Each structure stands twice: as structure tokens, then as C-alpha cells.
């Protein structure tokens, strides 16, 4: 980030030195990465957290639960990709039809299909401004069965198996 | 709740620091002032926040994507990890 800000300072300093909203401009790259560095540096306090009594066992169990949920994240993203390639493959020709955006490009459909895990996606994403009611229904069934299968099965897997991990 | 608000502040200062120059750009409000961004970042725990909060009326697609990744990773990490921590550890507290 500081490299980027120094580059911007050198270009601009050469500019206003000569006298006497750029899309790719490096300064927005500096403000961009500087935020991620803020998040990481704020999240580096877990090194000095464990020293205290009541916070130690908490910090210790966190890592165990994360190590437990990784191997579920594997099958999670397997199902995610399995549905996402199907949906992108289904709606790829409709780019100028459906009301709301996405479900069109790969990177743009990955979004609406990722935010359905948290319930922030809209169902109205599946409607089409043509008629073609068969493809619309196929979208409703694929999206719904995605939600049911992956969310409802994988959540109960996570909870039941993590309680299984504590009891032993 | 201690570590909960630690992560909350850790993401909130990053997001406020990211969008602070865009005050006249993004469609929907907040993610701008400290007290105003704390709101949309608090209501994401309950799912009442909108994803459309991350879009920008300029182009600058890099900063928009950084917002999507920071907000998403916030949601995943803090909600999905801290909930399973709460339930698993509270059942651990009952059984003993």
C-alpha cells in the first residue's frame, strides 16, 4: 500500500513540479489494500490475547472448531461449484432478459449463488422477461433444491458432527 | 461477546476506512460515517442489512470488489464461526 502511495506521490509531484478519477490509478489501489491491512493488523491481537485467564480456553477452542469445519468446507464448495456451473450454463443466453442482474457471467452468478447461503439473495433473480416458462421453472427447481440440499443438509452435518466432536 | 465485539470493531474500522471518500457515490446510505457504518455492519448479524450497500455509482471496480470480499468474509468468519462456538460451548457447559 505504501509503495502505491509513493508511486502516486512521485507521478503527481513530477506533474505539479513540471508547471513551475482515473480507472486504474494506483491511489485507489492504495486506499483499497490499506483497508485489508487494517483488518489483518486489527486481527493480529490474538497473539497477546491468550495470556489472560478467562480468554485463554476460548482462544484455544476456536482453532479446534475451525480445524473441524475445514473438511466440511471441502464438500461445501464441491456442491457450490456443482450448482453454479449448472445455473450459469442455464441462463447464459438470457443476458438481456431477466429483471435483476447477475445469474449471467460466471463471476456474477457466483455472487448471487454465494449470498443465498446467508439469505441475502432475492428469489426474483429467477424470473425472465421473455415467456419460456420451462426454463424459468427449471431455474426455480435448481435454485430451490440447491438451497434445501446444501444449506439444510450441511448445517445439520456441521452441528451434529461438532457436538459429536465435543462429547468425545 | 468480548471476542465478538473485537471482530466487529476490526472489520468496522476497515470498512469505514475504505468507503470514507465515496460519501456522494454509493446508492444506499451509510458505510460512510463511523456511527452510520456501525449500523449497517451491526444489522448484518441479523440479516436485515442489504448487500446492495457495497455497490458504487462510480466505476472503480477494484474498491467495490474489496468491499464484497471484506463484507462477505466478515459475515462468514464472525457469524458462522462464533455461532458454532456459542452452541457447541454452551452444550459443553450443560453436559458437565
Amino acid at each position: 500500500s505504501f509503495i502505491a502511495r509513493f508511486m502516486a506521490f512521485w507521478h503527481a509531484s513530477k506533474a505539479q513540479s513540471i508547471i513551475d478519477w482515473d480507472p486504474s490509478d494506483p491511489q485507489i489501489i492504495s486506499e483499497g489494500l490499506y483497508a485489508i491491512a487494517v483488518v489483518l493488523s486489527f486481527s493480529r491481537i490474538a497473539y497477546i490475547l491468550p495470556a489472560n485467564e478467562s480468554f485463554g480456553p476460548l482462544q484455544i477452542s476456536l482453532g479446534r472448531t475451525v480445524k473441524d469445519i475445514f473438511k466440511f468446507m471441502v464438500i461445501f464448495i464441491m456442491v457450490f461449484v456443482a450448482f453454479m456451473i449448472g445455473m450459469f450454463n442455464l441462463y447464459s443466453y438470457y443476458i438481456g432478459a431477466k429483471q435483476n442482474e447477475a445469474f449471467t457471467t460466471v463471476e456474477e452468478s457466483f455472487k448471487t449463488l454465494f449470498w443465498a447461503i446467508f439469505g441475502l439473495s432475492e428469489v426474483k433473480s429467477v424470473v425472465i422477461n421473455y415467456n419460456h416458462k420451462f426454463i424459468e421453472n427449471i431455474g426455480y427447481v435448481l435454485y430451490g433444491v440447491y438451497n434445501v440440499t446444501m444449506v439444510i443438509v450441511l448445517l445439520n452435518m456441521l452441528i451434529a458432527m461438532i457436538n459429536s466432536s465435543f462429547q468425545e | 461477546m468480548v471476542i465478538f465485539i473485537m471482530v466487529f470493531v476490526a472489520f468496522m474500522i476497515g470498512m469505514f476506512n475504505l468507503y470514507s471518500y465515496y460519501i456522494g457515490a454509493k446508492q444506499n446510505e451509510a458505510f460512510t460515517t463511523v456511527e452510520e457504518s456501525f449500523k449497517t455492519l451491526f444489522w448484518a448479524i441479523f440479516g436485515l442489512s442489504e448487500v446492495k450497500s457495497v455497490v458504487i455509482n462510480y466505476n472503480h471496480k477494484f474498491i467495490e470488489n474489496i468491499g464484497y470480499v471484506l463484507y462477505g468474509v466478515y459475515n462468514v468468519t464472525m457469524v458462522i464461526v462464533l455461532l458454532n462456538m456459542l452452541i457447541a460451548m454452551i452444550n459443553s457447559s450443560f453436559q458437565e
Binding site: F42, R44 | I13
Partner: peptide, 22 residues
Amino acid sequence: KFVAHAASFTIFLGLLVMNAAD
């Protein structure tokens, strides 16, 4: 060394917040 190191980390965070505010 622990209280000093940790404290200086906290003033690093503080300078981050005050750099962000204005």
C-alpha cells in the same frame, strides 16, 4: 517486555484509528 510490546501494539492501532478519522 510483554506489557511494553503489547502496549505499543495498541498505540499502533490507535494511530490507525486517528489516521482514519481525519
